[PDB]
């Protein structure tokens, strides 16, 4: 069917592939989703501020 | 039947001799030393070994530089020889006898197995 070299190549391919290695989707509650949004938005704002500070300097 | 470190062994095979025959890193003296360390009587047979004794033998083998590791050292040396523009390395590459021999006739064994990847 397959050689040892062929097997090893397949294994190598698998290492890179998403076949049966990835978890379930990250589902959130609506409150949790909001909390996440507020975390991200605030962070983004902070990053923008920092960029402006550096740019201004 | 009596397996030890992967290598199979027929019963009634004298232990030290059997070890010498099978394992690449060890000859006569080394096998005797191992037996002495473990405390088997000389001319003890492979079938007589209990399970703890077998485990102790296996451990001793693992502690020693043997089998594949020993083979690799030899391969590494020949790779090193090849790397420098050496005569010996050149002979190894070309599958000729290395040890200052004649090759007008009778150099067949060298041709057969003087590779860079030696052992098999």
């Amino acid at each position: 069917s397959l050689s040892p070299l062929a097997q090893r190549v397949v294994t190598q391919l698998s290492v890179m592939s998403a076949s049966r290695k990835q978890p379930k989707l990250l589902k959130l509650a609506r409150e949790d989703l909001i909390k996440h949004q507020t975390i991200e938005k605030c962070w983004s704002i902070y990053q923008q501020q920092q960029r402006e500070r550096r740019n201004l300097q | 039947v009596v397996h030890i470190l992967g290598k199979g062994f027929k019963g009634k095979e004298v232990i030290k001799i059997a070890l010498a025959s099978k394992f690449y890193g060890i000859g006569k003296t080394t096998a005797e030393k191992i037996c002495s360390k473990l405390g088997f009587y000389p001319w003890m047979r492979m079938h007589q070994l209990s399970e703890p004794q077998i485990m102790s033998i296996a451990s001793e083998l693992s502690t020693m530089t043997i089998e594949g590791d020993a083979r690799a050292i030899v391969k590494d040396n020949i790779a090193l020889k090849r790397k420098i523009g050496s005569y010996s390395g050149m002979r190894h590459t070309l599958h000729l006898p290395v040890r200052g021999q004649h090759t007008r006739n009778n150099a067949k064994t060298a041709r057969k197995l003087n590779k860079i990847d030696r052992r098999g």
Partner: protein, 93 residues
């Protein structure tokens, strides 16, 4: 003649359902030639590595700052500079 792995039917990734390849990565500490440690994410399972030949001991990266070994071992009693001076007449060449 051409050595290949023959393809099976491809699995249909639906539009929107495609997920990004987040590979499994460990936080790995690299101690360089000197004692400066640096954390890097790595796919191979080894929490700690210490390096021998790095930029921090290479002369190109800091200009301002075993056959030979075997030879040294088995010509040790003689102690082999003075020896160079003794054995270096530059007439013949």
């Amino acid at each position: 003649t051409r050595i290949t792995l023959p393809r099976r039917p491809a699995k249909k990734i639906q539009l929107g359902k495609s997920r990004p390849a987040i590979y499994h990565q460990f936080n790995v500490k690299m101690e360089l030639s000197d004692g400066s440690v640096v954390i890097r994410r790595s796919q191979y399972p080894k929490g700690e590595i210490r390096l021998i030949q790095d930029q921090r001991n290479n002369p190109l990266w800091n200009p301002s700052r075993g056959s030979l070994d075997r030879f040294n071992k088995r010509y040790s009693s003689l102690f082999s500079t003075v020896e160079l001076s003794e054995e270096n007449k530059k007439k013949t060449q």
